[PDB]
Design a protein around this motif. Structure first.
Motif, PDB file in Angstrom:
ATOM      1  N   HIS A   1       0.828  -1.200   0.000  1.00  0.00           N
ATOM      2  CA  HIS A   1       0.000   0.000   0.000  1.00  0.00           C
ATOM      3  C   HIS A   1       0.865   1.253   0.000  1.00  0.00           C
ATOM      4  O   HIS A   1       1.757   1.403   0.846  1.00  0.00           O
ATOM      5  CB  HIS A   1      -0.901  -0.008   1.230  1.00  0.00           C
ATOM      6  N   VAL A   2       0.603   2.139  -0.960  1.00  0.00           N
ATOM      7  CA  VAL A   2       1.351   3.384  -1.097  1.00  0.00           C
ATOM      8  C   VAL A   2       0.744   4.391  -0.128  1.00  0.00           C
ATOM      9  O   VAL A   2      -0.466   4.648  -0.185  1.00  0.00           O
ATOM     10  CB  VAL A   2       1.323   3.912  -2.542  1.00  0.00           C
ATOM     11  N   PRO A   3       1.526   4.979   0.771  1.00  0.00           N
ATOM     12  CA  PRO A   3       0.975   5.955   1.719  1.00  0.00           C
ATOM     13  C   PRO A   3       0.738   7.302   1.042  1.00  0.00           C
ATOM     14  O   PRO A   3       1.189   7.563  -0.073  1.00  0.00           O
ATOM     15  CB  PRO A   3       2.060   6.040   2.804  1.00  0.00           C
ATOM     16  N   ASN A   4      -0.018   8.151   1.722  1.00  0.00           N
ATOM     17  CA  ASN A   4      -0.221   9.511   1.255  1.00  0.00           C
ATOM     18  C   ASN A   4       0.837  10.386   1.923  1.00  0.00           C
ATOM     19  O   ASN A   4       1.731   9.883   2.609  1.00  0.00           O
ATOM     20  CB  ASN A   4      -1.653   9.980   1.543  1.00  0.00           C
ATOM     21  N   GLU A   5       0.738  11.706   1.757  1.00  0.00           N
ATOM     22  CA  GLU A   5       1.771  12.585   2.294  1.00  0.00           C
ATOM     23  C   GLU A   5       1.742  12.638   3.811  1.00  0.00           C
ATOM     24  O   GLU A   5       2.781  12.885   4.436  1.00  0.00           O
ATOM     25  CB  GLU A   5       1.627  13.986   1.714  1.00  0.00           C
ATOM     26  N   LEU A   6       0.572  12.426   4.426  1.00  0.00           N
ATOM     27  CA  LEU A   6       0.525  12.340   5.883  1.00  0.00           C
ATOM     28  C   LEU A   6       1.322  11.142   6.384  1.00  0.00           C
ATOM     29  O   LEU A   6       2.075  11.246   7.360  1.00  0.00           O
ATOM     30  CB  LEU A   6      -0.918  12.266   6.367  1.00  0.00           C
ATOM     31  N   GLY A   7       1.178   9.997   5.721  1.00  0.00           N
ATOM     32  CA  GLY A   7       1.978   8.850   6.092  1.00  0.00           C
ATOM     33  C   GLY A   7       3.461   9.065   5.851  1.00  0.00           C
ATOM     34  O   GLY A   7       4.293   8.627   6.648  1.00  0.00           O
ATOM     35  N   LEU A   8       3.812   9.745   4.750  1.00  0.00           N
ATOM     36  CA  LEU A   8       5.222   9.988   4.449  1.00  0.00           C
ATOM     37  C   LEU A   8       5.851  10.907   5.481  1.00  0.00           C
ATOM     38  O   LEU A   8       7.012  10.726   5.854  1.00  0.00           O
ATOM     39  CB  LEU A   8       5.387  10.593   3.052  1.00  0.00           C
ATOM     40  N   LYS A   9       5.112  11.917   5.928  1.00  0.00           N
ATOM     41  CA  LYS A   9       5.638  12.786   6.966  1.00  0.00           C
ATOM     42  C   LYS A   9       5.911  11.990   8.231  1.00  0.00           C
ATOM     43  O   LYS A   9       6.927  12.207   8.907  1.00  0.00           O
ATOM     44  CB  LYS A   9       4.662  13.935   7.232  1.00  0.00           C
ATOM     45  N   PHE A  10       5.029  11.038   8.542  1.00  0.00           N
ATOM     46  CA  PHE A  10       5.242  10.143   9.672  1.00  0.00           C
ATOM     47  C   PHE A  10       6.511   9.313   9.468  1.00  0.00           C
ATOM     48  O   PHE A  10       7.385   9.266  10.342  1.00  0.00           O
ATOM     49  CB  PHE A  10       3.991   9.269   9.847  1.00  0.00           C
ATOM     50  N   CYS A  11       6.651   8.694   8.290  1.00  0.00           N
ATOM     51  CA  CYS A  11       7.838   7.898   7.998  1.00  0.00           C
ATOM     52  C   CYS A  11       9.120   8.695   8.196  1.00  0.00           C
ATOM     53  O   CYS A  11      10.117   8.161   8.684  1.00  0.00           O
ATOM     54  CB  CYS A  11       7.775   7.367   6.571  1.00  0.00           C
TER      55      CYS A  11
END
Length: 306
Positions: free
Chosen positions: A201-211
């Motif tokens: 599953h490809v994350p959105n930008e909120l998930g990327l900021k978390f990563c």
């Protein structure tokens, strides 16, 4: 003395019931207490690390508990098998914890169970100044072939040092908890290429900021294929509002847990570990709140939550 120690274990169980109550989950005492009693000394002695974990989505009706075990105690999986607390799998995952200690400096163990299902997992911690890489992990004969098969992939993304591993005996999976992550590894372009290469599953930008905030990244591997089953990014913090979801129920449920979960180091703020988990068909969220912490967790907060 004997009563004070017995009461400590009651207290840990009462905290487990409290944490589970925040999710509406009821605890099966007959599944939990035999485990707690077997490892009573670790819960009493001090230096304890205990945390209670919840998850979103199809997993939200479970509460996991994890309890540190000193190496001087000996392999806690052999303990639970010899005591009949868990049936041996007959599969290499049975050997992996003891095999890891044979081949590598292990600083600590931990056990993990679910409040309705009982024992399910062990952890092997490595010394922070002496962590193995992928090549050293793949020297362990009982480790999944998938580790060595993904070595090229791990090196290309900068996933090198491993702070601990975990063995799931029911699913026969292993997690490798990569540490000392570089900023290049957690930049959005790198994370996107990684999850895309792994077909998750490809994350959105909120998930990327978390990563980008992660102190650890852990893939799940198994003994059947070289395919990585899922990938988790972990964030440690005192901040109760960090769940990387835009769903209002998620935001509410995780903040509620993060501000009410039982803990014993009153006078400090709760230590929390959020996880963002990417699988082929979904993304879901985890949150562990520590009941007992040590200097390790405080040092991690200073490094990654400042």
């Amino acid at each position: 003395g004997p009563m004070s120690e017995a009461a400590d274990v009651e207290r840990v169980y009462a905290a487990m019931e409290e944490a589970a109550g925040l999710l509406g989950v009821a605890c099966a005492r007959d599944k939990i207490y035999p485990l707690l009693s077997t490892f009573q000394d670790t819960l009493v002695e001090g230096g304890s690390v205990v945390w209670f974990s919840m998850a979103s989505g199809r997993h939200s009706t479970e509460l996991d508990f994890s309890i540190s075990v000193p190496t001087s105690h000996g392999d806690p999986y052999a303990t639970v098998v010899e005591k009949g607390l868990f049936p041996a799998t007959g599969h290499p995952v049975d050997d992996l914890l003891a095999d890891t200690q044979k081949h590598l400096p292990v600083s600590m163990f931990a056990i993990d169970g679910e409040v309705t299902g009982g024992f399910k997992k062990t952890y092997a911690f490595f010394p922070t100044d002496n962590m193995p890489g992928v090549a050293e992990l793949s020297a362990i004969p009982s480790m999944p072939p998938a580790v060595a098969e993904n070595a090229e992939l791990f090196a290309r993304y900068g996933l090198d040092k491993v702070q601990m591993t975990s063995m799931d005996y029911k699913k026969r999976q292993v997690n490798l908890y990569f540490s000392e992550l570089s900023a290049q590894t957690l930049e959005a372009e790198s994370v996107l290429a990684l999850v895309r290469e792994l077909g998750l599953h490809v994350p959105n930008e909120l998930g990327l900021k978390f990563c980008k905030r992660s102190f650890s990244v852990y893939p799940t591997l198994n003994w059947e294929t070289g395919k990585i089953d899922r990938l988790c990014f972990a964030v440690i913090s005192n901040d109760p509002t960090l769940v990387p979801s835009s769903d209002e129920g998620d935001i509410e449920k995780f903040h509620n847990y993060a501000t009410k979960a039982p803990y014993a180091y009153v006078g400090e703020k709760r230590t929390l570990v959020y996880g963002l988990t990417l699988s082929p068909k979904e993304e879901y969220y985890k949150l562990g709140a520590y009941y007992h912490i040590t200097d390790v967790q405080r040092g991690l907060l200073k490094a990654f939550d400042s």
